[PDB]
Amino acid sequence: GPSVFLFPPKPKDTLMISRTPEVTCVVVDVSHEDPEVKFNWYVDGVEVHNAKTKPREEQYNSTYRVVSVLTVLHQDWLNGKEYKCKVSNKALPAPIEKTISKAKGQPREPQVYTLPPSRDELTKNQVSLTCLVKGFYPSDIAVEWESNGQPENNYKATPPVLDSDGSFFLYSKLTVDKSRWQQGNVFSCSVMHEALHNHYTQKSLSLS
Amino acid sequence: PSVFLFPPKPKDTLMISRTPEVTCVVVDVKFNWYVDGVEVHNAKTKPRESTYRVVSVLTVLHQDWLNGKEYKCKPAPIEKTISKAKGQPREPQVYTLPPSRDELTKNQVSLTCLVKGFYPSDIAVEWESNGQPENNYKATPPVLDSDGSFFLYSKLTVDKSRWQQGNVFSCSVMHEALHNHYTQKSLSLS
Numbered sequence: 583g584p585s586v587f588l589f590p591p592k593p594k595d596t597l598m599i600s601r602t603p604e605v606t607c608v609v610v611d612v613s614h615e616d617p618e619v620k621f622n623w624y625v626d627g628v629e630v631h632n633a634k635t636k637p638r639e640e641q642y643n644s645t646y647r648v649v650s651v652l653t654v655l656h657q658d659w660l661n662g663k664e665y666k667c668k669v670s671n672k673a674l675p676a677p678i679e680k681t682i683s684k685a686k687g688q689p690r691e692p693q694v695y696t697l698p699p700s701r702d703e704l705t706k707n708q709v710s711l712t713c714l715v716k717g718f719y720p721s722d723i724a725v726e727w728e729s730n731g732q733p734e735n736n737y738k739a740t741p742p743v744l745d746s747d748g749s750f751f752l753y754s755k756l757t758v759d760k761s762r763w764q765q766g767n768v769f770s771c772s773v774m775h776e777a778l779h780n781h782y783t784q785k786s787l788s789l790s
Numbered sequence: 791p792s793v794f795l796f797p798p799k800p801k802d803t804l805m806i807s808r809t810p811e812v813t814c815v816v817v818d819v820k821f822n823w824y825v826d827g828v829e830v831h832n833a834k835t836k837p838r839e840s841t842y843r844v845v846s847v848l849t850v851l852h853q854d855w856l857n858g859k860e861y862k863c864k865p866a867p868i869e870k871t872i873s874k875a876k877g878q879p880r881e882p883q884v885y886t887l888p889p890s891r892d893e894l895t896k897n898q899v900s901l902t903c904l905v906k907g908f909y910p911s912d913i914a915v916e917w918e919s920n921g922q923p924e925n926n927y928k929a930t931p932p933v934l935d936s937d938g939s940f941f942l943y944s945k946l947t948v949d950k951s952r953w954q955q956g957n958v959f960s961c962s963v964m965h966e967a968l969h970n971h972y973t974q975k976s977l978s979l980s
């Protein structure tokens with residue numbers, strides 16, 4: 583019989599009102615002999631109709647894959663509403679239902695601190711710019727580096743880490759060529775989190 | 791009944807004064823122990839403890855473990871084999887970072903130890919001051935960097951007054967690619 587997987591929206595899509603958060607319901611192992619699939623979508627028990635279901639696509643193991651995409655309201659997701667995808671198929675004894683919702687917890691506001699390279703690293707060709715984000719809850723977050731209106735993507739974040747007061751922290755490390763740091767270029771750490779005013783704050787870093 | 795074989799704590803393998811051990815835990819009893827096939831006899835088996843658990847502890851030689859030797863613990867007998875994670879060692883660089891000026895508003899400040907460029911991921915990072923291990927720090931797990939080496943960050947939280955008073959804090963790093971498997975970097979207001 584078919585199997586169902588329900589995927590949440592990207593955190594950043596839920597946090598930035600201009601972006602498009604979606605819940606995605608995927609169905610696999612749909613047989614040739616019972617190929618039709620019906621999706622029903624519910625937000626807190628109430629059925630919604632606006633979903634966009636894609637036509638079935640045959641896989642290399644002669645089974646079909648069918649995907650339905652529900653556009654969500656940012657506030658609905660952040661208010662903890664449950665999204666249910668019910669999948670119907672004639673090979674199933676009963677319809678398969680899957681429910682998901684935002685991680686629970688009292689929100690806490692992160693503090694964002696930029697830290698320049700250690701003097702000892704200035705011997706090297708590349709230097710590390712550090713963005714400490716601490717005190718946030720829950721763990722869903724987006725941390726990004728940029729300079730002069732361009733994303734800097736030679737960076738890596740640690741996963742969120744549980745701190746001694748029950749909040750999370752993480753560190754994001756931006757690696758840049760030493761000359762760029764010495765030349766006086768401004769680098770910025772953008773943090774996106776539900777407990778921030780407007781879900782956004784930015785802290786900048788440049789050589790003195 | 792099932793068998794679990796646990797490696798030594800990385801720090802025990804790295805500090806020659808410490809006592810690294812391989813631990814063979816059997817749950818729900820004879821033990822045979824082998825180092826690269828060759829049987830060894832020095833293991834110390836504990837007495838048993840609504841199912842029984844029995845544990846045998848083998849003392850290992852630091853250099854044997856770091857040289858990649860395999861440790862084997864034994865309807866039919868169950869065998870389990872373990873050894874050190876493989877990979878060309880790379881030396882970590884250790885950098886201490888003081889608190890951001892913006893955090894100096896707060897009652898507690900964050901002291902940061904960046905350790906980067908190390909391989910493999912086994913490591914020990916610890917904070918201390920005035921001959922005492924510091925209370926209240928947390929490290930991130932190792933993270934895979936864009937050049938294939940790992941990095942991590944260790945955050946020490948201290949009261950602002952301690953930072954302002956001029957107290958020295960030290961980040962100790964223990965890793966196989968370091969000379970003597972040890973390096974220390976200090977951080978203070980001055």
Ligand SMILES: *[C@@H]1O[C@H](CO[C@@H]2O[C@@H](C)[C@@H](O)[C@@H](O)[C@@H]2O)[C@@H](O[C@@H]2O[C@H](CO)[C@@H](O[C@@H]3O[C@H](CO[C@H]4O[C@H](CO[C@H]5O[C@H](CO)[C@@H](O)[C@H](O)[C@@H]5O)[C@@H](O)[C@H](O[C@H]5O[C@H](CO)[C@@H](O)[C@H](O)[C@@H]5O)[C@@H]4O)[C@@H](O)[C@H](O[C@H]4O[C@H](CO)[C@@H](O)[C@H](O)[C@@H]4O)[C@@H]3O)[C@H](O)[C@H]2NC(C)=O)[C@H](O)[C@H]1NC(C)=O
Nearest residue numbers: 585587589590592606608609610611641642643644645647
């Ligand atoms: C017949 O074929 C179909 C189709 O498969 C394709 O075609 C075939 C022919 C072949 O070529 C395949 O190679 C093709 O892919 C088969 O369909 C597959 O069926 C699987 C179930 O049997 C199903 O597996 C499940 O996958 C779940 C989803 O997780 C996977 O995908 C993630 C993608 O990311 C998503 O989520 C993140 C959020 O974190 C989001 O950012 C993304 O945008 C996206 O929405 C992966 O992240 C994830 O992990 C991979 O990647 C990470 C790194 O990111 C890495 O660390 C991992 O090692 C992985 O590589 C997954 O891969 C998954 O949740 C689910 O788990 C369930 O079960 C476990 C227990 O095992 C349980 O603990 C969980 O709670 C959970 O309930 C499960 O693994 C495949 O998704 C599906 N394939 C497709 C394309 O839809 C079909 O099975 C087959 N039939 C046969 C042989 O009979």
Ligand SMILES: [Cl-]
Nearest residue numbers: 805806807808
């Ligand atoms: Cl020692």
